[PDB]
């Protein structure tokens, strides 16, 4: 919160897709790369790179959908969350 940062986007409207990740983690980056490969419209936020108050905001948002607060956490329509680099699950949820 915000659900904003570095919109690597790209298009094909498949709703509101926001990925929270860490810039220093392989599967987080693999998740956004997957979203990029899918060619979908989305936002991604690298929490480790955020200033402290914002970084703390983003953490609190992630925990609303993921009490583990693990990354990656992808949030759909402000409603559903996909925890982890789960390709079929992400593909299925965006129509692939």
From TrEMBL:
<feature type="domain" description="Glutaredoxin">
    <location>
        <begin position="17"/>
        <end position="79"/>
    </location>
</feature>
<dbReference type="Pfam" id="PF00462">
    <property type="entry name" value="Glutaredoxin"/>
</dbReference>
<dbReference type="InterPro" id="IPR002109">
    <property type="entry name" value="Glutaredoxin"/>
</dbReference>
<dbReference type="GO" id="GO:0009055">
    <property type="term" value="F:electron transfer activity"/>
</dbReference>
<protein>
    <submittedName>
        <fullName>Glutaredoxin</fullName>
    </submittedName>
</protein>
<dbReference type="InterPro" id="IPR011767">
    <property type="entry name" value="GLR_AS"/>
</dbReference>
<dbReference type="InterPro" id="IPR036249">
    <property type="entry name" value="Thioredoxin-like_sf"/>
</dbReference>
<dbReference type="GO" id="GO:0045454">
    <property type="term" value="P:cell redox homeostasis"/>
</dbReference>
